């Protein structure tokens, strides 16, 4: 994978 910073 995801490009989202809130995923990890």
């Amino acid at each position: 994978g995801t490009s989202s910073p809130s995923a990890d």
Partner: antibody, heavy 121, light 108 residues
Framework: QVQLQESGPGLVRPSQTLSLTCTVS????????MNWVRQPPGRGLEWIGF??????????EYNPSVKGRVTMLVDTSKNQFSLRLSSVTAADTAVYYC????????????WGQGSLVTVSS | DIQMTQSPSSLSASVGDRVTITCKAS??????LNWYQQKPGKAPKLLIY???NLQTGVPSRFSGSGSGTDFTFTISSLQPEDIATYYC?????????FGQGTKVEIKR
């Protein structure tokens, strides 16, 4: 053909546990996170949480809004993710969706059809 | 939590018109703001991710801009199949939060 499909809509009794399954095909589902989002009839959207991928051991993040009532599972042998929400109330009546995290285009690049769950005795 | 406020809440426009919807975050979200389109009874669909990136296959008439706390979604020339409710979504931090949505209706 990426496919997501929540288990069928139906009733849950108040103070009992909502259970859903999100059955997937058409992609390496073990390489993408999976989110759950719900939409109370006539209202907007709410992100419930996500379950991570195989590399992360399928660890989770939940919205504090359902803090402590939700667990999200995976059964890799069945191409399935599951959602359990305990002690439901009138607030938990909604259409529940599973939505793939995605890679470049994220989050929520593919969505199931959604399943309406109604809280009622 | 970051609260997302959209405007207007609904609007009606004629086919061919330019439609601009705004989305404001209560605090900075850098560029991490996505736009989804939902039709009654159907799931939301991703149109744009991270402010201005069109998802593959989405018509070129859709676009977005902004940064920080203030964002915009634009349909250059409204088409009949574009009626829906459009939602913004911040994902710079958890919990991920949605705007309340903007219902786009057509006058004919």
């Amino acid at each position: 053909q990426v496919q997501l499909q929540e288990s069928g809509p139906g009733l849950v009794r108040p103070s009992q546990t909502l259970s859903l399954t999100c059955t997937v095909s058409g992609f390496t589902f073990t390489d993408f996170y999976m989110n759950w989002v719900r939409q109370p009839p006539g209202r907007g959207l709410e992100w419930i949480g996500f379950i991570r991928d195989k590399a992360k051991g399928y660890t989770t993040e939940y919205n504090p809004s359902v803090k402590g009532r939700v667990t999200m599972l995976v059964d890799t042998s069945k191409n399935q993710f599951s959602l359990r929400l305990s002690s439901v109330t009138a607030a938990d009546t909604a259409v529940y969706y599973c939505a793939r995290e995605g890679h470049t285009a994220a989050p929520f690049d593919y969505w199931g059809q959604g399943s309406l769950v109604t809280v009622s005795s | 939590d970051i609260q997302m406020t959209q405007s207007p809440s609904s609007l009606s426009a004629s086919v061919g018109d330019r439609v601009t919807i705004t989305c404001k975050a209560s605090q900075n979200i850098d560029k991490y703001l996505n736009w989804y389109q939902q039709k009654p009874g159907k799931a939301p669909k991703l149109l744009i991710y991270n402010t201005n990136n069109l998802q593959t296959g989405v018509p070129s008439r859709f676009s977005g801009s902004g940064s920080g706390t203030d964002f915009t979604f634009t349909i250059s020339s409204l088409q009949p199949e574009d009626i829906a409710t459009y939602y913004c979504l911040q994902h710079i931090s958890r919990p991920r939060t949605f705007g309340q949505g903007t219902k786009v209706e057509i006058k004919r």
